[PDB]
């Protein structure tokens, strides 16, 4: 005669140590503006 709940711990703390996903997310942005500038030059 007993019941219990449970609480999760989210972990995935390798990502969580940083903001969350910055491996191919923030770097992609970094190099994608570079693509934009080079294409601007190519079209110019």
């Amino acid at each position: 005669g007993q019941q219990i709940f449970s609480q999760a711990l989210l972990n995935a703390n390798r990502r969580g140590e940083a903001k969350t996903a910055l491996a191919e997310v923030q770097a992609r942005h970094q190099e994608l503006l570079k693509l934009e500038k080079s294409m601007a030059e190519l079209t110019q």
Partner: peptide
């Protein structure tokens, strides 16, 4: 590695076409 290759290809087309 795809994005770097695309950047390189764009740079090369830029070079050809500056010429």
């Amino acid at each position: 590695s795809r994005t770097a290759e695309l950047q390189a290809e764009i740079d090369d087309t830029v070079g050809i076409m500056r010429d």
